Amino acid sequence: SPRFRGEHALRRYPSGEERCIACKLCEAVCPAQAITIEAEPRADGSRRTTRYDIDMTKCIYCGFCQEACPVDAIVEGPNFEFSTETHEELLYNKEKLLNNGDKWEAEIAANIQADYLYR
Amino acid sequence: GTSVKPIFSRDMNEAKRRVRELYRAWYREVPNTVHLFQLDISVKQGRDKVREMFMKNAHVTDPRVVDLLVIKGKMELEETINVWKQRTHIMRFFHETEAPRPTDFLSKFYVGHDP
Amino acid sequence: KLGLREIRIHLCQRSPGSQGVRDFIEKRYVELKKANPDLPILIRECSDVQPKLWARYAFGQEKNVSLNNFSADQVTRTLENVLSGKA
Amino acid sequence: GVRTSPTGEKVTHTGQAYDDGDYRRVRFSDRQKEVNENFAIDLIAEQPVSEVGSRVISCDGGGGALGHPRVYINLDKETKTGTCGYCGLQFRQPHH
Amino acid sequence: DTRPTIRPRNDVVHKQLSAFGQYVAEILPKYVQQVQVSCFNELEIFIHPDGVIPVLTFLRDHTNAQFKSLADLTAVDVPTRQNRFEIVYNLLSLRFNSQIRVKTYTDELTPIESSVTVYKAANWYEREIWDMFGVFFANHPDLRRILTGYGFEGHPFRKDFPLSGYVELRYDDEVKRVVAEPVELAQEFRKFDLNSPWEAFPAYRQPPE
Amino acid sequence: PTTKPPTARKYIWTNHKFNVSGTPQQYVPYSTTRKKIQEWVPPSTPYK
Amino acid sequence: TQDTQLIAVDEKLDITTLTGVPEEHIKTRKVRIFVPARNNMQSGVNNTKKWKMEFDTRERWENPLMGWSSTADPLSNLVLTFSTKEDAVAFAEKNGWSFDVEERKVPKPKSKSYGANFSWNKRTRVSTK
Amino acid sequence: SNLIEVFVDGQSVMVEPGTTVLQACEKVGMQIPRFCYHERLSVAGNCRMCLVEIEKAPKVVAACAMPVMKGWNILTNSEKSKKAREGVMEFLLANHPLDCPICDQGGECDLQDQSMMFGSDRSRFLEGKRAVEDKNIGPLVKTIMTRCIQCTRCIRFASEIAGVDDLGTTGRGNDMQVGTYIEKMFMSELSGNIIDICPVGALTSKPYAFTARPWETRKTESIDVMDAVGSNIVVSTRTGEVMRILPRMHEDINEEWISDKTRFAYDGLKRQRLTQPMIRNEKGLLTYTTWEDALSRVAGMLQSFQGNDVAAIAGGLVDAEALVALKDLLNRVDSDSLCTEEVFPTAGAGTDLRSNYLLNTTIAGVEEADVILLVGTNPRFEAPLFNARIRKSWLHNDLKVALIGSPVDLTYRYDHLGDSPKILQDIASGNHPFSQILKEAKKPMVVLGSSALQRSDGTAILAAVSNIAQNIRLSSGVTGDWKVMNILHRIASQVAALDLGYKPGVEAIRKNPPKVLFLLGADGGCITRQDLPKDCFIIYQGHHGDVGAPMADVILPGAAYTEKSATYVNTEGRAQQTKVAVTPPGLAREDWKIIRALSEIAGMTLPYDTLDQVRSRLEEVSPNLVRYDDVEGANYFQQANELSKLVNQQLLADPLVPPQLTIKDFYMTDSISRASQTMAKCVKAVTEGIQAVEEPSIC
């Protein structure tokens, strides 16, 4: 279904700028506390995350982060095919989340276009 | 205030009695739990651990507290006797994997910030 | 050397148990410091303290002497005996 | 833009780059340091400065409800370009 | 209607439960201390510990009371009050279908008499409290530890007990077994500071002093 | 997708990648933050 | 009136050995009680109306993986609430933690009048509203 | 007496006539939601959230400024009161911009909390909102003026508290904008406090700008050490890292404000730091090493030399516990040159009497004084909180403030007697007219700063001021209990050191040069290598090695004031405690633990081993330094006056000039300040001009 909750990913605006303004709402929401953010005033100024890591082994795949996000920055992509071999492989990083949002992007855009009215 | 309700024991003497046959049971137990659980512990170094644990709570003077330790040791005794406990839990009292901890202030200063 | 290096006085604020020493330093202190200007007579006055006297001589040894309800002449004597023993 | 470290590692958009000794680089041998090339710092700079002619301008980030919350930036200061804090598009008066 | 969001108010059940509360207060004045019915039609009876067996029996046996079902049994640790632990008995009626709650208090050491006989369901629930709060129960048939791991210590639901516990366990090849080690987290629990400093409900304001 | 062209944009990958776990192209976690409290550089001039 | 074979027990409770706290956590750790000062960024008050106890902060090192905040003491993010400081100190002694006491600081009530914003001779006259 | 009975929604309370309604409600516990009234600021009745219903009254009245009358049951929870609150907030929250995820006030916004408690749950604003262009007013305060609610708290803080009347309002109607019109540079010593008076994120902290959402940071109480005031503060630390410092309420030390120097000083902790022990290599460079060899070298050459050849100069930010530990360690070799950077004239009583070196009348005592004499100080930068207290007493209690010395501008209209110190003895003579004022004032005041004592003729200045105090004390105008003598210090860890018996100043070292100088936090640089003889084991402890560290043989890293758990003393003598917020960086330990371990390695082991024992030992040394948060009553002034009064040491004609003369030098004082970068940013902001430090506040 278009609501399927899977691998977390960090989307970005059509201009290419990342949507995350590091409000840390998702960190204050995650019941498993799998999300960690450090913010900073960027060189341009926009308050992006110096660190944004989701501990997938702590994550319980609830979709609370996306519904908490006020800019639809964090989302859960339709991918479930990320069974890994090492525990460190599961512990994601900001760059890994950005790559996830840049690989599963047409998917997430199409699903959001078909689901934003419900939510 | 000072007046309180007992659990079983009325005075230090009777609780002192209860710990007596608790140590009785532990003594008569240690060898055949070494035998049954295939312990790597030896008989003497089994008994002295019981003695040191009994001496650990030497400071206790309130009666009700003594009934509490004696009934908790009673639960320990049941857990051990009918093999509900497991060999790892029996070893848990003996701190093997736990590295030795320094005691002097100088070593504490060398290691890190800790009182 | 062993001569006393500093003399510390701990007198209570208002309690009568430390009254006498309070009178002592009230009148019998200025000339006492004039006699030994080099010597640190410290007066670390505080509240609800029993009137006590520390004496640090040398090498880090200290001597303890109470002044509980000590009269002005009596505290004068308990200072003079220590000060005279410049060793 | 992504640049190489003196050791050879690819610096990140945050500026992270493990130093010379930095024993925590064995993690990357026989592997790779995953870095995203689409830097958000520069992918917003080349966007054109909108020349909408009004005193105060609304911005939702495009896509309506799919964008960021609607903010009213002020196109008042003549010496700089107003920008929405969420998205980052630079809005400016059409040279008054 | 005018109040489509606010929950419906059922005053008839409230008055009827209050009448039964006065009933039970009059019947057993020896152990009952304070009976009150909540706004959402749930009555609670605060009794002295010595009434754990009597009051329950009166609630289990009396023709006009007729409560034979132990819905649950629970302790609620609160370190502030002098006797920190408070035990709640939840009873449900069949002939007169309704839910009643009786609440008693005890500290760490003062034992509270074990129901079991009044409600044989209490037994396992009973064990939980002893294994989870330290509240020992007098002459309980078998008050052994029930939930926690073997050879455990403390009573985790005590509010002073840390969230992460004290000791974990893991494989050790040096001894070829699972061993217990003092706690060393890989990432510490961040304790968020919620509960905004602005008063929420004026109705439940604590009186000053 | 032939009948439903996905909305194209610059940042989307032009080549799908399977899960790279196992092969040396796998991902390894690492702190993506700058440095904490920074060390004081000793002087280079002589002691005197 | 409450006959249950009552016994005078003068010495204070020693539930320490019952609590299961390890020896160095019951000995070394020092806990302080206090009324938490309100966040000066806020004018709300109902957070300094309780007695909270908290323990001395311990080592906080960064793990090699992401520089997280791994710690060792479990009794670090543990704070206990109490209505009055007497209950808190009783809990502290009966548990056996070395305790420190800070008195409940409260705002002094100051005389405030809008008529002070204006004056004929007093310095308190304002210059702008 | 005059207490009038006033009901609040029922139950009645006893209320002083003239009390506002909101204070009467606070007497019970229920609080009016407000945005315009601050307890320590003037009232304006502006937010209109203070509206409440008076029983049998047609229209609601503003509880912020309403003299309560007889009876007058305050219906706090009345339906009309709730409706008034709802409407007033709907008006407040109409043009408020959608920045909650992007605004740092998020989670502790006040406005958000009132919306949660007393506010609607939906917006009927169908029109466009208002946007206001940002006005930069510093590298210290982030400015997003579209979020402002015109509560006028910043303006009133600028006028009364800070005294710099530059923050105002412009225009009218909905286009009214609060700012500075001119692109002016608001650089007072109390500017940062506007961050904590602004209910909304209109004004925020630039150095901390969006570093942590404040619902995560743990809060640990402690004491500021940047100043001798010892302002109570709270360190907000997340994930083992210091983010910011907020003021704590004390009402006797700092009210609820702190100086910008105190506030924005955490960044110094993250800069140049000492973490691992260092020793001089074969070429003379300090190379990193383990602890063992460092304590071994220290122990060896401490064992080699005894007597006066071993010294120790305590710095400015040191702790009392390590002061005791170092003094005791240096005592076991009979070394008695325990010096400190700040100099106090020891001629006469010296450090023997608490009355000599103390703000005897306490900080609060200045709120009832009549006339105050400042002996050549700059309290706007020497002690910002003390000057704030002086300003508030000048405002409300019409204090007549006069000073002798440098004509530094001091917010209020100070009466500049002059600059020459000669005037001092004239005041003692009484020929100067101001003397009569001191006689006529029922609570006269004279205070001489530590900086003016530093000079070169401090003994003469102290003697003259003591003679002045004695001359006015014999008059019956001053009550028996009212203290007059007052000495204001600047270094935080000076009075405590002087309490322990450390010889003030460094003259002892210069008299007979030592060989094993134990620089403990010493960073002023009063004693350099040239003054010392050849082959001196200068051992520099501390945290921020910038002056002492370059000239050293073995470096012993220490803990900063936010990492230890030691005690400090304010200028009035009250001994406060700083709790541990974040662990010391790297391998650095506490300052007393390292001294005790050094002693144990060297052989002369100290008796105390944990914090409680060293506190008990310090109690043995001085019984006031353990009694926390209460001024130990200091007296015995007259005998101290008769004690010195022997030397003449004729006063030099040099005008009194405090080392700090303009806000530019208020920032760069200690090692922590020098390490900081934001301190340098604001310094360069002050120096050249306005257009140098503009930091974009929108992002």
Ligand code: SF4
């Ligand atoms: S689904 Fe997302 S927000 Fe929820 S716990 Fe997992 S990572 Fe956190």
Ligand code: SF4
């Ligand atoms: S909720 Fe969204 S915008 Fe806020 S920190 Fe999380 S990902 Fe970023």
Ligand code: SF4
């Ligand atoms: S200050 Fe304004 S933007 Fe910031 S949280 Fe409050 S209401 Fe939201």
Ligand code: SF4
């Ligand atoms: S800028 Fe802040 S303090 Fe000043 S009036 Fe606006 S909201 Fe109030």
Ligand code: FES
């Ligand atoms: S308090 Fe009523 S408007 Fe400020």
Ligand SMILES: [K+]
């Ligand atoms: K603010």
Ligand SMILES: [Zn+2]
């Ligand atoms: Zn935008």
